Amino acid sequence: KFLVIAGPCAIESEELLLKVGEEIKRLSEKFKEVEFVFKSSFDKANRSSIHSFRGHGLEYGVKALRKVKEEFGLKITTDIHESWQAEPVAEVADIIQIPAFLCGQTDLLLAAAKTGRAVNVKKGQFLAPWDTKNVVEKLKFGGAKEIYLTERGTTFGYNNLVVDFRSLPIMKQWAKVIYDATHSVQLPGGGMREFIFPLIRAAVAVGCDGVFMETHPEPEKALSDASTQLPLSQLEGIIEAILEIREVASKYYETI
Amino acid sequence: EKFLVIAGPCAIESEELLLKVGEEIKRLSEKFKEVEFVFKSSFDKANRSSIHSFRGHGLEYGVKALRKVKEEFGLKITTDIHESWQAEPVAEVADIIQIPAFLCGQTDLLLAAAKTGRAVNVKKGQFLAPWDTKNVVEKLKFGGAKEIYLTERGTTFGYNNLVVDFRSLPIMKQWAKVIYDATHSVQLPGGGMREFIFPLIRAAVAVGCDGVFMETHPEPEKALSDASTQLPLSQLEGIIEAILEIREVASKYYETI
Amino acid sequence: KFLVIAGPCAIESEELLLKVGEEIKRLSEKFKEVEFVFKSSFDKANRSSIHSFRGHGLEYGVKALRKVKEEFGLKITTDIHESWQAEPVAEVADIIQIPAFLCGQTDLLLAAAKTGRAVNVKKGQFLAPWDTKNVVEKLKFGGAKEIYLTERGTTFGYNNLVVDFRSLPIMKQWAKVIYDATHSVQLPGGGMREFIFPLIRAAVAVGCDGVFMETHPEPEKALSDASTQLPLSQLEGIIEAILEIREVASKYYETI
Amino acid sequence: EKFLVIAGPCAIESEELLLKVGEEIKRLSEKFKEVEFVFKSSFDKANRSSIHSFRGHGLEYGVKALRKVKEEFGLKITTDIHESWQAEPVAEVADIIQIPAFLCGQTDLLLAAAKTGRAVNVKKGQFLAPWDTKNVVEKLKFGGAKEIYLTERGTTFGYNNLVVDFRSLPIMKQWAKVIYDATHSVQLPGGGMREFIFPLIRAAVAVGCDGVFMETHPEPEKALSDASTQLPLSQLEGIIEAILEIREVASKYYETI
Ligand SMILES: O=P(O)(O)OC[C@@H](O)[C@@H](O)[C@H](O)CO
Ligand SMILES: O=P(O)(O)OC[C@@H](O)[C@@H](O)[C@H](O)CO
Structure with a gap:
């Protein structure tokens, strides 16, 4: 099914997550052809400023994401920043997200793959498209x-x-x-x-x-x-709108 | 509004190549009536990388070949100019005068195209930011386009x-x-x-x-x-x-400028 | 000799050219190891705005540059914008300058080479260094x-x-x-x-x-x-300063 | 001021390779007394393109090899960390903790290096504008660097x-x-x-x-x-x-910040 990963950038509060989750649940019921995945970061690990909002911690984050998956039966995805976070996060995340700046960190990718979950890697801003082949191979090597x-x-x-x-x-x-x-x-x-x-x-x-x-x-x-x-x-x-465009355009998607 | 499709062989290799593509474009113009087709071909490739590459058969020959296409198929014409003096003779046949990407900032070339009364299509330079095309348009309007x-x-x-x-x-x-x-x-x-x-x-x-x-x-x-x-x-x-189909389904979502 | 091409951007007036020319002449007398070339544009052919200053014309420009070369015995260089300008400009320009945006215009390069003068091409902002080989070859073909x-x-x-x-x-x-x-x-x-x-x-x-x-x-x-x-x-x-840096650094310039 | 030269083999291939380069660096430090040499080598290449490329012999081995170099030649040491937990053990031997280019924005890694009391060298990310390194420095100062x-x-x-x-x-x-x-x-x-x-x-x-x-x-x-x-x-x-000679002749012209 076509994927739509959506949610608030940061887990500002379990409250915010449940409000956004409700709407996503509703759309989930409306667009059955689409697999919706609720996304939200428990930590903004690379804010420009030391004084900016990072979040409320992994534990609190995983907890709130658990509330969303429980209350609405929605799949979950959140990003990890260091290898040790893979396992605890994999308890609730159906898809583990690898930050763009960390897409080349072998240990992070391997720790993501080991959890058995799905892995979504954000292509680094410095990365050429053809160089993502190796990223994928690292993950396959790790069992993804x-x-x-x-x-x-x-x-x-x-x-x-x-x-x-x-x-x-x-x-x-x-x-x-x-x-x-x-x-x-x-x-x-x-x-x-x-x-x-x-x-x-x-x-x-x-x-x-x-x-x-x-x-x-x-x-x-x-x-x-x-x-x-x-x-x-x-x-x-x-x-x-994207479903309508996709319906017409998909006729021309090149084979691959 | 009528969608524009500008098409044709890159260079005027011969009047014969032109009539061949021209016939196909004429045929499609009869089928896609919601499209305004404009036949394109350069009488000169003024900036090939190598001095040894094909440039063309000259301005006179090109215009004549392009005229034949317009004459035989009733197709609109567009071709590019490389120096100011070319605008006048080219405007004889071209409905749209094209300005090459590298020359999109040359004031005189722009003014020369503008005063002919013909439409003007500027290729955005590879070095130009989208917002800096505003002054290119201003120059053209100033010049009569x-x-x-x-x-x-x-x-x-x-x-x-x-x-x-x-x-x-x-x-x-x-x-x-x-x-x-x-x-x-x-x-x-x-x-x-x-x-x-x-x-x-x-x-x-x-x-x-x-x-x-x-x-x-x-x-x-x-x-x-x-x-x-x-x-x-x-x-x-x-x-x-394919593009008319995608355009249609996407159209209701085009933002208003 | 090491080259130093200097002068005011545009020929705002013969006056300005003579004032700058004087100073350049003086430096010319001071740094005999350096070949000074007086530069100034008779026309700013691609100002962003139609309302900006372009200049006073080719004739007036060549005239003022002639005054500089005559009064101070300095070599001259100015840029051309269309093929027809090569010849008249070559009467006074020891070096014909090809604008960066026009470095790929075969006819302009050939018209520059035909005059017999030296040709200095500004590398286009879109051009890779190795692709300047062809620019040079066009000029050689044209007799430069x-x-x-x-x-x-x-x-x-x-x-x-x-x-x-x-x-x-x-x-x-x-x-x-x-x-x-x-x-x-x-x-x-x-x-x-x-x-x-x-x-x-x-x-x-x-x-x-x-x-x-x-x-x-x-x-x-x-x-x-x-x-x-x-x-x-x-x-x-x-x-x-650049002569001093050059004197020390030149020892390490790679052969080519 | 003492110019810094950070040099060494990219990866700690073996303690032997390290001592070899170390000896040469020690020798140059005796000749170029106006230079502060810092021996560098990574105990781990955490982001090779391929999963099949050489990474290293581990943190423990690397630090020990680096310690041998400092011990035998009296050279300052620098190596890079890839996750927060590595800062402490690495600070045991490294005089300067290096932060990889891709990780120059990771707040925790920066804070972890800063609180060790060691000097910190951040490689500017390939994606980072020069002016945006200001906040990277702010984070470090905030962290004690x-x-x-x-x-x-x-x-x-x-x-x-x-x-x-x-x-x-x-x-x-x-x-x-x-x-x-x-x-x-x-x-x-x-x-x-x-x-x-x-x-x-x-x-x-x-x-x-x-x-x-x-x-x-x-x-x-x-x-x-x-x-x-x-x-x-x-x-x-x-x-x-060569660089000391160019530095010297150019130095009187360095602009004041
Ligand atoms: O194939 P070469 O000779 O490199 O030439 C490229 C150009 O002629 C052309 O593609 C460019 O669009 C012209 O402006
Ligand atoms: O040679 P590959 O495997 O592409 O690796 C490049 C990197 O290890 C290295 O050069 C880069 O500096 C590390 O951050």
Whole structure:
């Protein structure tokens, strides 16, 4: 099934997670052809500033994600930052997410694969599409079976990311490909939000196995990625649109 | 609104090659009535990498060949100019005067095209930020151009590589109609190539543009220029049908500028 | 001899040219080991804005440059923008300059070579160093004998240029290499001026055949490139510095 | 001020390789008394492209080998950490804890290095703008680091290529001492390579930095990692003499931060 990974950027509170989870559950009931995966980070490990919000800890995070999976029966995904976190997180995460900056850390990938869960690696901003082949192989070596590669932009000069859509067909040669519509338009360190929907449309017209989107009831108040999180109320309309585009465009997806 | 499809062989190899592609384009224009087709071919490749590559058969010959195409098929014409003096003679036959990517900033060339009264299509330089096309349009308006197009053809990304930053489509749409060049955007000046033409063109129409530009040739492998990226003529119909379908389903979601 | 190409960006007036020419003449007398070339554009053919200063015309420009060469006996260089301008300009220009954006225009290069003068091509911002081989060959084909390639930065994301110093040894394989210290730090369309001297030092430590620098009595009032033109009073100090660095570093210039 | 030269084999292939390079570095430290030499070698290559490449002989083995070097030659030591828990044991022997380029933003790793009391050298990420290293330094100061270095090792430039934007040297100098990594800056992740090490290092000292980082190996072609860019041990002396000479003549022109 087509994948839609969505949720608030950071686990600001179990409350926020349950509110977003409700809406995702509802959409889950509405779009049965789509496999929804609830996503949220228990820790923002590389905020620019030491004074910025990181989170409430792994334990509290796994707990809240457990509440979401229990209350709504939704699959879960969260990102790990050091090898030791793989196991505890795998208790609740159906898919373990590997941060873009850490996509080359062999030990992190192996610890993810060992848990037996699915692994979704965010393609580093410094990484060429063809060089993700080795990332996938490390994971296979470590016993991984369900492997995803997520396109999230590429370093383009300073404080800018460009999305090279040629990467989708290239990465598809060795893994299921996910398009990160949120982080692909943010400026590291223009007008971010206005480009999220247009690029999402491009991703499905080109061909991918799923889309990743951060969403918040009130993006304006988000403690992380405030400028790019999609207002929860707009999620349905966007999903309906990509399914329609996908339905027509899929006829032309090149074999691979 | 009528979607624009600019297509044709990269270079005017002969009047014969032109009439051949022209006939196929004429046929598709009869089928895709919702599309405005414009026949394209350069009378001169003014910046081949090597001094030993094919340039063309001259301005006079090119214009005459292009005139034959318009005459025989009733097709609109577009070709590119390389120096100011060429605008006048070229405007005799060209409905749209094209400005090469490297020359998108040359004021005199822009003014020369503008005062002919013809439409003007500027290829966005590989070095140019989407927001900096605003002044290129201003120059044209200042020069008398009433119909202006900006063509997305990729941006310098490291050495011998171009990337297409699709954010440029809605940015440039603020001041001109936008065309997506499906051929030159996948070329490696000096990823691979042809295998990416179709997927990137699908992305372009999903994002939203006013037209697409595609070089096509009966036998790409024998073309005297851009043999690697020129689309096989027989594949044109399918590509066009596909983009009209994607455009239609995506259209209700195009943002308002 | 080591080359130093300097002068005001645009021929704002014969007056300005003579004032800058005087100082350049003086430095010419002071640094006999250096071949000074007076540079100034009779036309700024690609200003961002239609309302910006372009110049006073080719005729007036060639006239003023003639006054400089006559009054101070300094060699001359100016840039052409269309093929027809090569011949009239070659009457006074010892070196014909090919704009960076036009470095691939075969007809412009051939018209430059035909005049018999020296040709200095500004490496396009889109051009890889190894791809300048073909530029040089076009010129040789057209009869050019004294050929220079000028490093002036490379497109690095939007509105930014980076200087890849690997380009100097690479281009030296087929032409004399000049480093443009002025345009290499400007932001197309950070803090420009503060980086001019540091990068100039790098260029000579690496190894080049000359340096290109725009200078103005009062950069602040320049009608073109106001933010990057070097104050005339600082030129001597910079030249003395690059000669000293060159004297020590030249011992290590790799053979080629 | 004492110029820093950080050098050594890329990976701790064996305690024997270490003592060999160590002896040469000890010898140069006796000749170049105006230089502070720091012996470098990774106990682990935590991010080889392939799962089949050499990683190392483990933390315990590495630290012990590095300790032997410090013990036998009285040389300062530096090595890189990959996870927070490694900072403490590594600080036992390392005078400078190095933070890998890809991890330059990992707050916990930075804090872990900072609280050891050792000096900290951060490799500037290939994705990081020079001005964004300011917050990396802030994190370290916050964590207790009193001696901080930022290492220039190139920036992503298209695919499989890095460019060195020398404007970064004076920018980063605003908040930390700066080191130029002569080895990794010419590497093509995943121009050519070794032929550019020396020229770029000359540019670095002409611009101005507080030290240079260079991987050297008795026989580069046999190294288990970075064989292509590791400098032949016999060439180290000459490279160092050359940069001290260029540094000296350029020094009076170094701008004040
Ligand atoms: O094939 P070479 O000779 O490199 O030429 C490339 C160009 O002619 C052409 O693709 C470019 O679009 C022209 O501006
Ligand atoms: O040679 P491969 O396996 O590609 O590895 C590159 C890296 O180990 C190394 O050069 C990089 O500096 C490590 O961070």
